[PDB]
Design a protein around this ligand. Structure first.
Ligand SMILES: [Zn+2]
Ligand SMILES: [Zn+2]
Ligand SMILES: [Zn+2]
Length: 178
């Protein structure tokens, strides 16, 4: 197994996957690494199994159909994995915890949103459709762009949104277009 966390790239108290060489901090994995379970398979492994059991699940989909899916166990897992893929980028630090807004010439958003809030909401089964999860994720970046206006820091929101969107298209097998 790897000797660093797959998500944050640090050493520490690591739980090792039984079916691949990845390792995780307890609360870096999503869902948090399960208490018992021998063997244990990480979220990467669980996603690969879904694909392997239903190869057709990789054929292209329309985003509008994906968003309307109910949050059954496989879609819950896919949104957990997509969230985890965003935490895998170090620039997610800027969006992880609760923001505050006091900048001359700007007003804070009406509905603040942040990664750990989405993480709690997934853990608490608060989303009934994929759309709920995706709307909160996109809101994070939209709030950031609007607040930071012409400051170059706006680019951090573009960068992390790009990571989200590329992973969304991969994980939910969105039909490729120009
Ligand atoms: Zn970690
Ligand atoms: Zn694994
Ligand atoms: Zn099948």
């Amino acid at each position: 197994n790897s000797n660093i966390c797959e998500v944050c790239n640090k050493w520490g108290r690591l739980f090792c996957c039984d079916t691949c060489p990845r390792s995780f901090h307890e609360h870096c994995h999503i869902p948090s690494v399960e208490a018992n379970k021998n063997p244990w398979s990480c979220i990467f492994c669980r996603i690969k199994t879904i694909q392997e059991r239903c190869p057709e699940s990789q054929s292209g989909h329309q985003e509008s159909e994906v968003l309307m899916r109910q949050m059954l166990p496989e879609e819950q897992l896919k949104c957990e994995f997509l969230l985890l893929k965003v935490y895998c980028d170090s620039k997610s630090c800027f969006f992880a915890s609760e923001p505050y807004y006091n900048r001359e010439g700007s007003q804070g958003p009406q509905k603040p949103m942040w990664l750990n809030k989405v993480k709690t909401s997934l853990n608490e089964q608060m989303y009934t459709r994929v759309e709920g999860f995706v709307q909160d994720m996109r809101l994070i970046f939209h709030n950031h762009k609007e607040f930071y206006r012409e400051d170059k820091f706006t680019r951090l929101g573009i960068q992390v949104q790009d990571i989200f969107e590329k992973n969304f298209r991969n994980i939910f097998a969105i039909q490729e277009t120009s």
